Amino acid sequence: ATFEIVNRCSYTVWAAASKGDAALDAGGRQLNSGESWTINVEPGTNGGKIWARTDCYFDDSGSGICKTGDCGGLLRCKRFGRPPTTLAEFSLNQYGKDYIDISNIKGFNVPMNFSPTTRGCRGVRCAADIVGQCPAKLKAPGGGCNDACTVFQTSEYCCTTGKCGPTEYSRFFKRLCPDAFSYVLDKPTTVTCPGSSNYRVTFCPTA
Template identity: 60%
Template sequence: MSLSRNLPTLSFLFVTLFFALVHAARFDIRNNCPYTVWAAAVPGGGGKKLNRGETWAIEVNSGTKQARIGARTKCSFDQSGRGKCETGDCGGLLQCKAYGKPPNTLAEYALNQFGNRDSFYISFLEGFNVPLEFSPTSNGCTRGVKCAADINGQCPKQLKVQGGCNNPCTVFNTDQYCCNSGN
């Protein structure tokens, strides 16, 4: 792994990954939405309210795996950080300690894993609540991933909830929509 390299960016949040040290990576999460989101990062990041244009930087270990960054919407928290969110709620806590409740568009990543490579992708496994972009910023990797479609506007009635669109597995919980059998 190189000592200094940049990786991803998100556009509900815009996440930029900087490798400042061998043992850490930095994600800059920026809200590009025209509304407030409450960013969530697990493991290690917690959560933060981001108004349009605001940025939140988090540091993660270079060996981090099964990590997620997401945006929660229409949240309300008291002074102690307890409350709730319309989408992506993580146990009623501002500082997330577990994954959020669907629907929740996610940027998932793993750092310094197979062959010392990093991976990142956008997941709709837990549904959709906000558009998302996750893109490299330098060091030869120029392609990112982005979902800017109006999925909430096109969501089938059976999957639609306030503020988002559920994955069929979340709603129906059948083998037809869920990968439960390993086949």
């Protein structure tokens, strides 16, 4: 499957793509404002994620630090990134179907649109100003808006027992972005697409 990753933000982001134990394609790349990066993701990939990282410094060996989404200090991510990270999530060719979603379960750093470039399903978007509106206790100094599990580490926020309800904090993410997961047991906003669809992830889709 082909993913075009487009940075429409006015600032540079460092895109990342991983399935948790391995990079997807190169795993990460700088995207200046306007730049597009096309990656190929193997069919049948389960649990892939794409996200943006902000305010990164890397040396010539690809080692460094980012203020949001850092994946162990590497330009080319092999693992998932440190919250807060708006997440494009996908499982491909699962019994003939692709499944995509946007998740705020690990917080929010960059607005995002996640849309198919082929026919047969709708896209999803979380483009509200969540950082600007972020509750005081969830604000991340590096930028972005943390989820409550990351901040407070309770069974309720993290849904550790498999039973949990919405919270004041999850309802904040849900109010601004209804089409993104706001907590683990949120009513699913997953979109079902034809197997082997292709996609575009756009950072800062509106502004």
